[PDB]
Amino acid sequence: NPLFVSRPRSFGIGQDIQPKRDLSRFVKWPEYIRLQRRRKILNLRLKVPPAIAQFQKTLDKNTATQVFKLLNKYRPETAAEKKQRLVAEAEAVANGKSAQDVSKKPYNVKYGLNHVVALIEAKKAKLVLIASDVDPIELVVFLPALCKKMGVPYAIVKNKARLGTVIHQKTAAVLAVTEVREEDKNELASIVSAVDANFSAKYDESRRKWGGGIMGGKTQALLAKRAKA
């Protein structure tokens, strides 16, 4: 015990070699990492037009959870389900009526940008879910305006990947709900009411609300200190 003695290091300027510390904020990151970080910085800067800034507003956790719970009950058939249905239809067709006599009416969430746009124009989509991270934003920038013009409920949700998960795809740009079962009629109506109270009721206000335009970083504190005194 007497042999065990304290040997501290001052770590001051010009005294001891500095210990190992995190240098991530000073690391020269690769080009693609720098690009994807300075991109988000650039979007934070600059005045974003309202048609693009409207996608920064997204459904909260509980409504998104409720929406996806409704979606999971209406999902497209997988490969095994499609094969089984085709086998049953083929077996029944030979010794009976057509496939419509053994196959029920499908109830699933419509997907595909062109298909969803056509449904909105045809006033058949009772709920529209628009991804908030579509890299070419022109694909969905007109969707809120089209939905408002056609009077159909539309909501902006995160994770286009999560939207594609329900339809068993890597990524879905937009999902549409047209027909729902009786046991889920009330759930769809409540979801529509909550969505309309957040997006349709504020569409006119969001048309004139420019996004971004925040200096942030160090200069925000610098301006605050200068304006304090």
Binding site: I13, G14, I17, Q18
Partner: protein
């Protein structure tokens, strides 16, 4: 005509002879130690740099981040000796041989190897016997006014570093070369610029001044500033000519 010697000095055989040169005379990388406190180095060598009148100083520092030592190539200041301790930083003492920010020093101090911008590792006052005088300061938008060896007044940010003292080497131009041999040896370790043939001694094809039955220019030697290459010879944009009979 023909391409003149001035146009031919773009490189090739006109490059500097740098085989025997020991390295650049940069001060140091502006780091945390110099920005906030000071760092101590030991002058381990004072050597001669071929092609340069002033001596050079090899100074060994201690790396603040790794187990290592860094050897610098300061421009030697007069009075410096091997084994001397030099200090570089904001909190360094006003002693000859130390490197301090210009904004941390009083008015009228004589310095050398002064930075034009904080971090370029020395730009002003580097030749032997030359120095820069700190004329004044300005705290608001911190900038320091200094007087250059040519008499010009320059404003620099009050974070540029300079070495207290005068560049070693004293008065070198006071001694005549006394023969072409000394001139030959002086410029041999510098570049291919010596000797020089007069333009009037050439032919009209070679130089604008060449030709004629007598060695003469025939046109005013003062040429405009906006002169094309090949005719920008003689006195370029001369404000005045003749003996400087009184100047300040």
């Amino acid at each position: 005509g023909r391409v003149i010697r001035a146009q031919r000095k773009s490189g090739g055989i006109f490059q500097a002879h740098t085989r025997l040169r020991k390295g650049a005379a940069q001060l140091r990388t502006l780091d945390f130690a110099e920005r906030h406190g000071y760092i101590r180095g030991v002058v381990q060598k004072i050597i001669h740099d071929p092609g340069r009148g002033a001596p050079l100083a090899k100074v060994a520092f201690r790396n603040p981040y790794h187990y290592r030592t860094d050897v610098e190539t300061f421009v030697a200041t007069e009075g410096m000796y091997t084994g001397q301790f030099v200090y570089c930083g904001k909190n360094a003492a006003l002693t000859v041989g130390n490197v301090l920010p210009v904004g941390e020093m009083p008015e009228g101090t004589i310095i050398s190897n002064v930075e034009e911008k904080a971090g370029d590792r020395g730009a002003l006052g580097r030749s032997s016997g030359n120095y820069v005088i700190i004329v004044g300061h300005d705290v608001d938008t911190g900038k320091t006014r200094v007087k250059l060896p040519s008499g010009a007044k320059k404003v620099v940010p009050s974070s540029a570093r300079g070495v207290v003292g005068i560049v070693a080497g004293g008065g070198r131009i006071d001694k005549p070369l006394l023969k072409a041999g000394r001139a030959f040896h002086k410029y041999r370790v510098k570049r291919n610029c010596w000797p020089r043939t007069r333009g009037v001694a050439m032919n009209p094809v070679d130089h604008p001044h060449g030709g004629g039955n007598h060695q003469h220019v025939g046109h005013s030697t003062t040429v405009p500033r906006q002169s094309a290459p090949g005719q920008k010879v003689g006195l370029i944009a001369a404000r005045r000519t003749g003996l400087l009979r009184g100047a300040a």
